[PDB]
């Protein structure tokens, strides 16, 4: 009974936050964005088709120069790409062909690769050796590496299927700080631009904030009704948006801690697998389990643009930091970029 | 259109040629999925064909075999089951003498794993092979503990036929598919002969589907 008396005091604490959640929220963002002129139509044509893989393409990440990108496919090969000239620059064999994530370092020196093999692999691109060699293997997880992201050249934060997120360091290869609190396996994580706070999404119908330095949970965001497949952060750093299997894309603020709106359409029953923003907002790219991608207005939740290039389910998506193009990969073994 | 651009085109052609050769070399290998449960004789099957997933490779005659053992994953199956869509065959290992054990008997919950994996939307047409284990101990010890509804013979062969019949008809998704059961003696010399004759029986019919005949 001693655990049971701790339950209802935690439930009223959950009632203590949620009425304070409702005390802050009286008017939504949708009534605020009535006066703003709608974006209209966004016609985007495939400038370059970065194909050359042989199996299902699962993850991509843009480089900081917005020319090179890294693409991970389930054949067992990792390819660094070039945007304008459409010529691959590096082809990286993988020790484990099972890969579900990839990361490009902000410095451009390193590339992180993972998968369900419980190993994180980091590869040095511009070696004095001249070849591409793995710096070292990273083995401290017991699930499946859902997503790994480069916080820094020396600090890398990954999200794994053992219901935990862990901060690593290359020079020692051990967990400096580990993040626990997600009941189910996490699926994606998107760090803020200042690389101090980051968020993770799981199969909990909820997402939780994290502070990198001391490794404690800051915020607990819920409102979903199924597993979050992909998450993305607002480049302002003051908001973020999520995608799930519920075919609803929801927008959240960090300190205002509320669901601003849900991006749902009746014809869209297929869930979301990739979310990315624009630099100024006013846009939300979203990839669905249906074979076309989709573009949403970030402020009015309208059917702004439609991207129907691929014939298979889109798995990965991303945008350049200068905004020049958006990238999109799918299980059809093709990469194509619009503008 | 300079020397640097020409040499970039050169290196792109080089990497494309290497990638095409690597893909043609990789395409010959046969992919097999093992879904052996706890104490299902995974050690027995890996000893008879000879922290994450364990990958093993063996050669039979002129054909390569590439099997990936999914063991101790401890995660939600739906997130990573679609990674094995291109795998030709799914191998199932089930112990038979563990019908006297309850965690909710292992036998009954084993059918729920098979019922779920058969009725999924990714595995509409993937040939299913299931094996057995501990059948001699099951014959020695045996009925009323796990299957009182049979209400029949305690004899081993009729009981083994009863258990094998229940797994063959978990659901009607096996109608479009093809189940390949085999009485695994756990001492039989090459039970990969069951697999090799089954995996070629997929390959003729996979060719026949692609041949535009049947």
């Amino acid at each position: 009974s001693e655990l049971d008396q701790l339950r209802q005091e935690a439930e009223q604490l959950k009632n203590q936050i949620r009425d304070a959640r409702k005390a802050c929220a009286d008017a939504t963002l949708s009534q605020i964005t009535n006066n703003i002129d709608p974006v209209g139509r966004i016609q985007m044509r495939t400038r370059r088709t970065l194909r050359g893989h042989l199996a299902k393409i699962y993850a991509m990440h843009w480089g900081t120069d917005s020319r090179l990108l890294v693409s991970a496919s389930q054949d067992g090969k990792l390819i660094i790409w070039d945007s304008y000239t459409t010529n691959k620059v590096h082809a990286i064999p993988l020790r484990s062909s099972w890969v579900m994530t990839c990361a490009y370092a902000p410095s451009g020196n390193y590339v992180a690769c993972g998968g369900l093999d419980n190993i994180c692999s980091i590869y040095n691109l511009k070696t004095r050796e001249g070849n591409v060699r793995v710096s070292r293997e990273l083995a401290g997880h017991t699930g499946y590496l859902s997503c790994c992201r480069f916080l820094d050249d020396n600090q890398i934060v990954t999200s794994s299927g053992d219901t935990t997120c862990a901060l690593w360091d290359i020079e020692t290869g051990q967990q400096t700080t580990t993040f626990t609190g997600h009941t189910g396996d996490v699926m994606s994580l998107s760090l803020a631009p200042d690389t101090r706070l980051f968020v993770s999404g799981a199969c909990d119908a909820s997402a939780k904030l994290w502070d990198v330095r001391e490794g404690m949970c800051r915020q607990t965001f819920t409102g979903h009704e199924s597993d979050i497949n992909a998450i993305c952060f607002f480049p302002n750093g003051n908001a973020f948006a999520t995608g799930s299997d519920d075919a609803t894309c929801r927008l959240f603020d960090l300190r205002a801690d509320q669901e601003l709106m849900t991006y749902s359409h009746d014809n869209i029953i297929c869930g979301i697998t990739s979310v990315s923003f624009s630099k100024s907002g006013r846009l939300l790219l979203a990839g669905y389990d249906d074979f076309n991608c989709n573009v949403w207005d970030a402020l009015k939740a309208d059917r702004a643009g439609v991207l129907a290039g691929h014939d298979n389910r889109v798995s990965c998506l991303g945008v350049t930091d200068d905004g020049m193009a958006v990238a999109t990969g799918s299980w059809d073994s093709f990469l194509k970029i619009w503008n | 259109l300079s020397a640097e651009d020409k040499a970039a085109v050169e290196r792109s052609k080089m990497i494309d040629r290497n990638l095409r050769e690597d893909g043609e070399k990789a395409a010959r290998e046969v992919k097999l999925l093992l879904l052996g449960a706890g104490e299902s004789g995974k050690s027995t099957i890996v000893k008879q064909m000879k922290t994450g997933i364990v990958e093993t490779h063996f050669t039979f005659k002129d054909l390569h075999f590439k099997m990936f053992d999914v063991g101790a994953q401890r995660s939600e199956r739906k997130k990573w089951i679609h990674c094995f869509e291109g795998v030709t065959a799914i191998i199932f290992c089930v112990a038979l003498s563990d019908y006297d054990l309850v965690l909710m008997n292992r036998m009954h919950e084993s059918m729920k794993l098979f019922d779920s994996i058969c009725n999924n939307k990714w595995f509409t047409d993937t040939s299913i092979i299931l094996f057995l284990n501990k059948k001699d101990l099951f014959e020695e010890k045996i009925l009323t503990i796990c299957y009182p509804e049979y209400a029949g013979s305690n004899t081993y062969e009729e009981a083994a036929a009863y258990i094998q019949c229940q797994f063959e008809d978990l659901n009607k998704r096996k109608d479009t598919k093809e189940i390949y059961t085999h009485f695994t003696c756990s001492t039989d010399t090459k039970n990969v002969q069951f697999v090799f004759d089954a995996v070629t029986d997929v390959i003729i019919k996979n060719n026949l589907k692609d041949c535009g005949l049947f």
Epitope: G130, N131 | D5, A7, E10, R11
Partner: single-chain antibody
Framework: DVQLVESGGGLVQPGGSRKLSCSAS????????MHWVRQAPEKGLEWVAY????????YYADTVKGRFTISRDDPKNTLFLQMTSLRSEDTAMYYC??????????????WGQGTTLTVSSDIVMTQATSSVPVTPGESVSISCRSS???????????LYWFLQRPGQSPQLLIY???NLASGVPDRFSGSGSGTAFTLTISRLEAEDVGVYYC?????????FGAGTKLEL
């Protein structure tokens, strides 16, 4: 780390033939492109030959074409060059050069030791004065002009600066007119216009003494400069 050692550089009868080989070790030479660069025994650095990464594209010079050939063999990891019909112009200190070619790659990054080989249009690029007297601690600037502008349509100019250390192999300082090479201090920095090109040496000390060079990279001829011997 890596080793580029050359073999068989000696006396050859005029008009004869000599096999020249560059033994490579410690890098992915199957992926690396290879060059050959002539150094005259007194003065004058210039290009000899180019071989592809996959041995598909081969280029030569005006006095090099036909009577020179260059080959390679990846499994034993060495570079080859069969050389015919030698004379006084062929008398040279031939250097072994590696060069990798992709986006952000630094070609001509490492050089071999050389061959002591003695016997018995094109883009003009001139360095202004071959001798600049300096003091160890003040900043100097040198430059070389180009016949034509090196600014290609993709917005990237192609020019490389080199330092001939006195008596041994050179090195690459800055590649494509703006990006310094690895292992080089940040004091060296090149700049200039689309046709005017210059180097800015800042706070030089007692190891920068030597002959400096600049190269064109718009075409596979890869024409050199005259050379500025930077004496103290």
């Amino acid at each position: 780390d890596v080793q580029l050692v050359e073999s068989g550089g000696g006396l050859v009868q005029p008009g004869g033939s000599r096999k020249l080989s560059c033994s490579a070790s410690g890098f992915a030479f199957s992926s690396f492109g290879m060059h050959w660069v002539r150094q005259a025994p007194e003065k004058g650095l210039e290009w000899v030959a180019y071989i592809s990464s996959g041995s598909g594209t081969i280029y030569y010079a005006d006095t090099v074409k036909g009577r020179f050939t260059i080959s390679r063999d990846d499994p034993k990891n060495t570079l080859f060059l069969q050389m015919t019909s030698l004379r006084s112009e062929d008398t040279a200190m031939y250097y072994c050069v590696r060069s990798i070619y992709y986006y952000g790659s630094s070609p001509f990054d490492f050089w071999g030791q050389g061959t002591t080989l003695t016997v018995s249009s094109d883009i003009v690029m001139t360095q202004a004065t071959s001798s600049v007297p300096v003091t160890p601690g003040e900043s100097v600037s040198i430059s070389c002009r180009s016949s034509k502008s090196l600014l290609h349509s993709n917005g990237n100019t192609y020019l490389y600066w080199f330092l001939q250390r006195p008596g041994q192999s050179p090195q690459l300082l800055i590649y494509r007119m703006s990006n310094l090479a690895s292992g080089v201090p940040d004091r060296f920095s090149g700049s200039g216009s689309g046709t005017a090109f210059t180097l800015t040496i800042s706070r030089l000390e007692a190891e920068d003494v030597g002959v400096y060079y600049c190269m064109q990279h718009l075409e596979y001829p890869l024409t050199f400069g005259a050379g500025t011997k930077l004496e103290l």
